[PDB]
Amino acid sequence: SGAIYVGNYRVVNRHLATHNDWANLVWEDSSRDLLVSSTTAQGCDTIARCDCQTGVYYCSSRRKHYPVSFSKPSLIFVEASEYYPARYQSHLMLAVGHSEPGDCGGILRCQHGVVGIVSTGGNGLVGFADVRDLLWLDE
Numbered sequence: 001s002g003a004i005y006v007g008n009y010r011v012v013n014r015h016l017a018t019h020n021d022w023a024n025l026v027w028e029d030s031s032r033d034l035l036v037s038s039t040t041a042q043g044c045d046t047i048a049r050c051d052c053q054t055g056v057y058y059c060s061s062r063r064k065h066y067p068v069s070f071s072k073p074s075l076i077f078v079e080a081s082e083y084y085p086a087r088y089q090s091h092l093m094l095a096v097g098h099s100e101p102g103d104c105g106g107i108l109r110c111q112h113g114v115v116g117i118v119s120t121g122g123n124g125l126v127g128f129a130d131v132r133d134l135l136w137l138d139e
């Protein structure tokens with residue numbers, strides 16, 4: 001679990017969005033595993049606007065943060081799960097690191113701010129849904 005709180009927006013993994021997230025829907029994209037909902041309170045976070053390929057993510061299944069090198073956002077095949085059929089997930093960045101289901105929502109940050117959230121994993125890999133291209137989050 002986990003979310004990004006920026007301005008009057010909450011960014012979560014689409015597959016973990018609550019009834020309240022869907023009742024206050026701003027934008028969602030199944031191909032990216034992202035959903036953004038509106039909030040009444042002003043959020044705690046800054047979004048990175050950069051091309052960093054290194055940063056640090058929070059791994060809830062270890063209660064720890066780990067440094068990672070990650071690929072540029074791209075279209076990557078993701079196996080079928082209970083939440084989606086087998087498909088290509090876009091804007092996804094992979095890195096070598098620990099992740100379990102439950103780790104989705106952990107933030108990846110670089111020195112400029114929030115880069116994205118954990119969205120996929122397994123086999124010693126961790127995948128992050130990129131948010132740096134969503135310029136409207138702080139416009």
Ligand SMILES: NC(=O)[C@H]1CCCN(C(=O)Cc2cccnc2N)C1
Binds near residue numbers: 033084089
């Ligand atoms: N389609 C998606 O974005 C995900 C939906 C939930 C299930 N998916 C995983 O990759 C979970 C996972 C498996 C094993 C270790 N770590 C993990 N985070 C795919």
Ligand SMILES: [Zn+2]
Binds near residue numbers: 048050110111113
């Ligand atoms: Zn950066």
